[PDB]
Design a binder for this molecule. Structure first.
Ligand SMILES: [Zn+2]
Ligand SMILES: [Zn+2]
Ligand SMILES: [Zn+2]
Length: 90
């Protein structure tokens, strides 16, 4: 999370690529880490989808087994409207 100073939200325009979650993170919200009920499918930007992290867990980088969602509280607070929710290093 950030917290960290070199870490931040990509927030680039999301495209058609769908964020994933590993077995460990399944059900968890990409933004708040809660298990509030899933509300909207996570999409990531073309750059976050490229490379080593492709198809990997959007939260931890583990092997993706299911699609990531924003929870209902997050969609109410409009956290899905900011763009790509992946944490990046910069
Ligand atoms: Zn949430
Ligand atoms: Zn991104
Ligand atoms: Zn994970």
């Amino acid at each position: 999370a950030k917290h960290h100073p070199d870490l931040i939200f990509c927030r680039k325009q999301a495209g058609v690529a769908i964020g994933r979650l590993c077995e460990k993170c399944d059900g968890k919200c990409v933004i708040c880490d809660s298990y509030v009920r899933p509300s909207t499918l996570v999409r990531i930007c073309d750059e976050c989808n490229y490379g080593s992290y492709q198809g990997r867990c959007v939260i931890c980088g583990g092997p993706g087994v299911s699609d990531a969602y924003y929870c209902k509280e997050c969609t109410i607070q409009e956290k899905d409207r900011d763009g790509c929710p992946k944490i990046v290093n910069l």
